[PDB]
Curated annotation (Swiss-Prot), chains A, B:
It comes from Molineria latifolia. This is Curculin-1. GO terms for molecular function: carbohydrate binding. GO terms for biological process: response to other organism. It comes from the Eukaryota. The keyword Protease does not apply. Coiled coil: none annotated. Residues 1-109 form the Bulb-type lectin domain. The lineage of its organism: Eukaryota, Viridiplantae, Streptophyta, Embryophyta, Tracheophyta.
Length: 111, 111
């Protein structure tokens, strides 16, 4: 899995993976990015909670919630409400794209 | 792969895959979608050319180009120049999300 769509959840100890990269939301709440197992970046929120999960909101904001729903860390960046996609890319970057520009259907093109 | 980023190209006979869905740009220019190996959708541009490829532009426009670089078919929908992502979703819908909302970095949040 290399994509997390808005509204979806990555639960404790699960990861996104692309090429040599992995993005894991750890049970103890640290969101960590690895390159061949080497920690290259982290939200630096280890042990700030337990049973943590990662979710992408309808406005594109990326947030880590602990089991009691406290907002542990977030990209703290939002756009208009709609549908977004977090992509862990083979180049190591995890980018949030959105909202929807196009898909099939009548008024399927934004603006 | 289930994602096609701006600047990337899916070449003739190659496809995106997600769950039970496959999206193939055929050499003869027809973009075909399959559900468990069975065609359920097509751009309906078969034989409009040869050596065709599918690419996503920096403005989010999705285009099928033949080997002579003629625009055979496209989403004919675009936004500001930036970065977009075409995602073939597990539910079978292929959606173009963009532009970038957020990424790690000093100027990572759109607006």
């Amino acid at each position: 899995d290399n994509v997390l769509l808005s509204g979806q959840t990555l639960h404790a100890d699960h990861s996104l993976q692309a090429g040599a990269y992995t993005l894991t939301i750890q049970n103890k709440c640290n969101l960590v990015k690895y390159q061949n197992g080497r920690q290259i970046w982290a939200s630096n929120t280890d042990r700030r909670g337990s049973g943590c999960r990662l979710t992408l909101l309808s406005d594109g904001n990326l947030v880590i919630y602990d089991h009691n729903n406290n907002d542990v860390w977030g990209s703290a960046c939002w756009g208009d409400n709609g549908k977004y996609a977090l992509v862990l890319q083979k180049d190591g970057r995890f980018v949030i794209y959105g909202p929807v520009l196009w898909s099939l259907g009548p008024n399927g093109c934004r603006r």
